[PDB]
Design a protein around this ligand. Structure first.
Ligand SMILES: N[C@H](Cc1c[nH]c2ccccc12)C(=O)O
Ligand SMILES: N[C@H](Cc1c[nH]c2ccccc12)C(=O)O
Ligand SMILES: N[C@H](Cc1c[nH]c2ccccc12)C(=O)O
Ligand SMILES: N[C@H](Cc1c[nH]c2ccccc12)C(=O)O
Ligand SMILES: N[C@H](Cc1ccccc1)C(=O)O
Ligand SMILES: N[C@H](Cc1ccccc1)C(=O)O
Ligand SMILES: N[C@H](Cc1ccccc1)C(=O)O
Ligand SMILES: N[C@H](Cc1ccccc1)C(=O)O
Ligand SMILES: [Mn+2]
Ligand SMILES: [Mn+2]
Ligand SMILES: [Mn+2]
Ligand SMILES: [Mn+2]
Lengths: 456, 459, 459, 456
């Protein structure tokens, strides 16, 4: 059966209405194709819901991301490639939040500064496609906000009812993320006890034992110095997703009050969003929509990026020079990061703006296995981050963070790591609805390796 | 042409067998006020709810339990409040924010006046159902049972009992709860900000002069904390818990979950809310609501009206608090202001004698409802104040703790209850009578009442 | 047969040459009220003091400076108090504890009433000297100049000026300061405990009824903090700073030390105290006290009596606050209650006009001293209250900050000042007139005055 | 010249007066010989002074020492062998406090629990002697509370005026210890920066670099976790001295209020005191005076101690079984600690009392050099602590702490350590008025070594 929602029956200031209309009249790639009257109806509903986030959390994220930009904190961004309606369950959510928290404790120690924790959750329900027609000859699956994963024509029709289903799934998950992080799951001592169990049972546990012991002693030190533990009991986890579907993003806009300067438009589907490689057209609607909202935004930069084009994103998206307003996410592939990134970094640094430089070591290293599965090699992922570190150290700039696809589940999607996942093993638990994710073990292992990168 | 959007539903281990076996035994009891829809459809919706993200988590409920234990011991005070009936249509950011705001305002004043913590519980995120007296409504239509069951609109189609609503209810509850959590951790519940709203109310209210001393005195108490250099993090956020009447057993049972036993034994919680209560209509001693309440580990409350006997109250205590956990059980009295002074004392004496430690909570609003000449179901402010007054006098005389209050309020400037300082009359009621069920004290009246009760606490 | 014990003295780099050269230039100025003892003996005692452990350290003084800057800006309030003249004989644990206690009691009340922090400064640990008018005392003996200089006892031998006292003074100052630090970090200065003493005073005082509302209101302010879950460490201890009139330049100069320049440039501090002031007798503009004050980095104060002109006050400001550091300089007014309203305004206007930010502090006690029929030098409570009243009215009218008070008090139940709620009369004075110099408000009177001044702060 | 104090011109409850009189009528070894009328006069003065400590600090020390006794904190006790009137100066005091704080940070890290810091200060002005007549043929110097260090008959006369001079010097120093620890000298970050400078310049700095870096990262971790730093800004340092001169100790008694049970006698010359080898007669006045006061007390136990005698001290001095009330200080010599301590520990553990076991690795290892100077070898000191650790690990009991003689000054009194102080070097800066102390460098080095003992 179905559940069914009623379509409901003070205007923006003029300049925001004009700028917003202007931004949305620009070309927009990768949009779903569904009737405009039905999309309007869905938007009317989403214009009336409880937002997923609120403005003052977003100004707080901004301030924390400014610290990152200045070289005083570090950003960790992670979760599923594609969340699905069917896996939006308590265990799946709790496990991803847990996977992210584990990595955080280790990176916090290794960087010797705060880690801003941003999950890819409560909203990554859509994806772009290079091909409208997939390898089975079906209309491509573009994520659950648009259509269905199942391989059949009917399920692949673009269905606007999904926009509301997506909000409903986002809100519920977010509710649970908030409950879990303020309720004990994000207690530092508890999270660190899970890291100890992993060191104990991982096949490469011995390799990571020193670092884990040193973290354990750091914690006991705090306790020994009688420091208050209130701040150890909870953590903040922000939500993020690629802003891809403009029907969804525009219905989730809300105007803030003037309790901070003038009223502004915030996208309250998330705390921060980014724009992918296939929608980053400089004169396109995604970049223009990003210029209009006050959220922190990110732009993915791949191997054809030029230094001049990167400067142009910075001048469009960070025109007031607010450190941390903009994050540039490098995804070049490991074999190319060392050569392609430096000139982009030098040129952007020369502008006097303060962007966060973030490494996406996953997307630029995807390949197909002999066994059929889309996959990435652990060592290639590690090595991109390694080269990202080297590029920054040579230029004296801040390696700001990482952006990774992970899960808390024990899936077999990426080859290698300590568990030595082979081409054979991939068939066991290849569960992603899109790209291959790091395992819970692999995601934690990578945090150990990166901590070392931070320590040297 | 329907003005509706259909949202498809797409059909985790079950609860363990020993718990399922106890739970089956309990829900075999008869259940009053249940929705009349097909069992096979109800099952299907329950199956969906059995696998969604819960609205609350167990360790928030163990923390509420501990705070309610302090209430039961006379060391905190319980404030419980919100809409009589939430609807899907008004489950919006501004309505939610205004109710949360109204509850916080009252809390600052009651905190000061009681000189002890206030456990703040709001009736939101799941209060979408109601019982009925009447088979058929005055319009000759099947009665409205709340949005979890059917539609308010006066037409046959909307009044059919629609199990899809079980899911729509969960979706609305989860979204509202999300927003309550955001707002209370993000600045809306900053003490200084909330108190500035109380100051604007004092400057503005027609009776502002009456409340001025208390407001100034609270202001100085705040400025003192700052002066002493102890204005810490704790002033910037507050906890607001969720509660609703547990009425629809299909909803409540599908939202049961087992705690993971990392901080005790594995237990059964209803994760549709932090705490729930059982209304007058469904509190049959051998009925399924009371048995459901015994089974879950959440704190629970039972409403007690004018026909309550002391022996029946004792039986609730022995059924629902059998392990003697202070604060596990709250007894709410809604006897009407003219009767509270006579009816409550013997009930209190008898329950005290059992050696259990219940929270005694006053529901002033329910026992004092009447119809106006102008049509509208309404309650009079002075009757509400006066029931709380008498509730305080009863406890004073017995040396027991007046534990808290349970009120129906909103942040909106509605005209549903007569009186208060704005002097709402019978003809004013027509202006903004917006409730989908009982009349709710408006934002000014709800705050005024908190001043009056603070005075009660102090003397 | 002497009733005395001789304690032998046994004779670190010097201060740097550039500072010594400036300091020599300054102390070549003439110095009023100095002790008449041999220079070679004074040198020897100074040599001993140049190498003892200081009484205070520089970073406490930089912290006092910052807190006094908040006073000067209208964001805190300064309370300064203790004995007129400490003696060696009464420099005991119970006397010290009772004075510290009296000051803390007043502070809680003034904190509440001012709704802002109180910088607590006590006249102890070094206030062992006094100026004189009279060559010869009424007994035909050389005058008593305080225990740093000679003996109180009425006999020629004791009245000889004895430089050994410089060391005895340091030893007593250091021991008393040790005990002040212990007591304030160890529980005597717990806010809840101090306030319970104020409650016992209210229950007991003959005017207790008059002060009851304010005391209850403070109690509720405290209970609020606890209710809000912010009753932190900061309520358990308080800082009390030391101060005395810098009169004897042999003492003060030997206690100079250079800060180590790990938190700024190297500077010269007088580490006999945190802050010192210069009295009416020694404030000559071209004299050595004012020049000594300019040279040290401590906060300093200057007493201003009824002959002060606005131009002379401006000159103090330009000499002592030449870098415009708010709170570096405090101007204290002791003009008598009958004259404060007329004399102070023009002084304030003129100093404000300079663009400097001084602390304006009231010394109610000094300008209101008289002799009773019964013999005793005394002050009347009502005159003291009334000078502070007028000091408040002056500042109100000009829109300037009444910055604080400077009072002579003790924790003992002495009978030195007439009036207050105990209604001390001329014949009661004989009972316990124990001061070695001016009359001091007793513990009840000192607390009563804090209530009255809190009322002044609030309106 | 001299300064001169006037002799001044509510009784104890009867039972305390009786118990106290009883205790002082017992034999008392090592007392000064000076006229009783003059001693009375001095006592009359000291009965009237501001105490050096107050009772509620002593109940707080007690509670913290109970944690030590239970295996949950660790005790560090240290300072000069003999303080003198002439070296009671701001730099000397600040340096000893600093030396103790440096060791503390390192031991706090290494033990992973709190360190109770107790200085031997504001009162160790007296010492016992084995010989009344020293090697020069003079009346022995017994410390500045009794007589003068200078080698001449006159200065060695026992002078009761010194009792008051001692209080005056104690009070002043204590004042300064309180000021310094609440004012910034005991800021953790500042103390740890001194440890970094020492690692950088010590000849064995490389050996200690790992541990120092690991502490540095532990501190930055706290900062990275946003923990409140108020408790990092100050430390508590308690005062202690051997209770040797009963004329001094008895004049510094004060009766507490009944704000905690019944009124009791506290010795307010210090927070805690101990009884040396030469005054610990079981039926002597020192042990009996210790039974009467409520302060935490310690008893030094040397190589002739039997297990039965140790049990008897425990039953006399800890008769109510208050954990931490009594500390037994082992000083056996390194060659003997392994053999002599175990049976003493087993027997005392069997009583069910909970004493603190503390190692004094200095006294049992003193020897004379060819060059004339009384001295101890660094390696012997380290090795006693090593064997003290081994004895406890084998029995599963808590190595509770150490008691050492140190200074902040760069003296040459103990041979060895990284600076490799030789017999020749001793002549340079042999400044102690009694036993040889560890250097600032040597004292810190020993804290590194002990941290390792704690870590393994
Ligand atoms: N203040 C918190 C500390 C914290 C609590 N849990 C975790 C888990 C992982 C890293 C850090 C923390 C914070 O840093 O967000
Ligand atoms: N610790 C919070 C104090 C608080 C913060 N905001 C409000 C609003 C209303 C009452 C109290 C508070 C608490 O007591 O819950
Ligand atoms: N933080 C302290 C508060 C305090 C503690 N004891 C007292 C006694 C009197 C006044 C204040 C306090 C302070 O304000 O200094
Ligand atoms: N709470 C303090 C922490 C501390 C501050 N300074 C130091 C110096 C050495 C060791 C510890 C500390 C404490 O542990 O006493
Ligand atoms: N798994 C979710 C269940 C859900 C229903 C309604 C709201 C939120 C979640 C879905 O299929 O949409
Ligand atoms: N007003 C809500 C809007 C809503 C839709 C979906 C989920 C949550 C809320 C409703 O009509 O159901
Ligand atoms: N009353 C003090 C006692 C004292 C003696 C020595 C030092 C400190 C205080 C005196 O007569 O000097
Ligand atoms: N060095 C101290 C100086 C001193 C004098 C008086 C009191 C305290 C210390 C002495 O010789 O006694
Ligand atoms: Mn992906
Ligand atoms: Mn109702
Ligand atoms: Mn005076
Ligand atoms: Mn020694």
């Amino acid at each position: 059966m179905n559940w069914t929602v009623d379509i409901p029956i003070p205007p923006l200031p003029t300049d925001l209405r004009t700028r917003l209309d202007a931004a949305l009249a620009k070309p927009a790639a990768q949009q779903p194709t569904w009737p405009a009257d039905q999309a309007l109806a869905m938007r009317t509903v989403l214009e009336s819901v409880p937002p997923v986030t609120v403005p003052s959390e977003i100004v707080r994220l901004q301030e924390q991301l400014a610290q990152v930009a200045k070289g005083e904190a570090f950003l960790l961004q992670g979760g599923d490639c594609a969340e699905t309606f069917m896996d939006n369950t308590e265990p799946h959510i709790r496990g991803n939040v847990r996977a992210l928290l584990q990595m955080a404790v280790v990176l916090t120690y290794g960087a010797s500064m705060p880690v801003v924790k941003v999950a890819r959750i409560a909203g990554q329900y859509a994806k772009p496609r290079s091909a409208d027609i997939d390898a089975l000859g079906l209309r491509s699956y573009r994520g659950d906000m648009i259509n269905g994963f199942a391989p059949d024509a009917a399920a692949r029709e673009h269905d606007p009812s999904r926009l509301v289903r997506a909000y409903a799934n986002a809100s519920a998950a977010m509710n649970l993320v908030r409950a879990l992080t303020s309720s004990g799951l994000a207690s530092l001592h508890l999270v660190h006890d899970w890291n100890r169990e992993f060191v104990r049972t991982s096949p490469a546990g011995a390799r990571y034992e020193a670092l884990a012991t040193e973290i354990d002693r750091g914690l006991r030190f705090m306790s020994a110095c009688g420091v208050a533990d209130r701040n150890l009991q909870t953590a903040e986890i922000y939500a993020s997703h690629e802003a891809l579907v403009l029907d969804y993003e525009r219905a989730m806009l809300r105007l803030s009050d003037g309790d901070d300067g003038e009223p502004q438009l915030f996208d309250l589907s998330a705390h921060t969003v980014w724009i992918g490689e296939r929608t980053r057209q400089i004169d396109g609607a995604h970049i223009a929509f990003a210029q209009v909202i006050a959220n922190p935004v990110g732009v993915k930069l791949g191997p054809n990026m030029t230094p001049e084009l990167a400067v142009e994103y910075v001048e469009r998206l960070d025109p007031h020079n607010k450190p941390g307003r903009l994050t540039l996410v490098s995804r070049m592939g490991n074999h190319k990061v060392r050569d392609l990134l430096p000139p982009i970094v030098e040129k952007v640094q020369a502008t006097g703006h303060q962007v966060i430089w973030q490494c996406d070591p996953m997307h630029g290293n995807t390949h197909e296995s002999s066994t059929g599965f889309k996959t990435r090699h652990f060592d290639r992922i590690v090595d991109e981050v390694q080269g990202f570190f080297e590029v920054h150290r040579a230029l004296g700039t801040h390696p700001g963070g990482i952006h990774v696809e992970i899960t808390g589940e024990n899936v077999t999607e990426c080859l290698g790591g300590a568990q030595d996942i082979s081409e054979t093993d991939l068939a066991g638990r290849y569960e992603t609805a899109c790209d291959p994710r790091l395992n819970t073990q692999q995601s934690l292992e990578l945090a150990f390796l990166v901590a070392e990168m931070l320590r040297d």
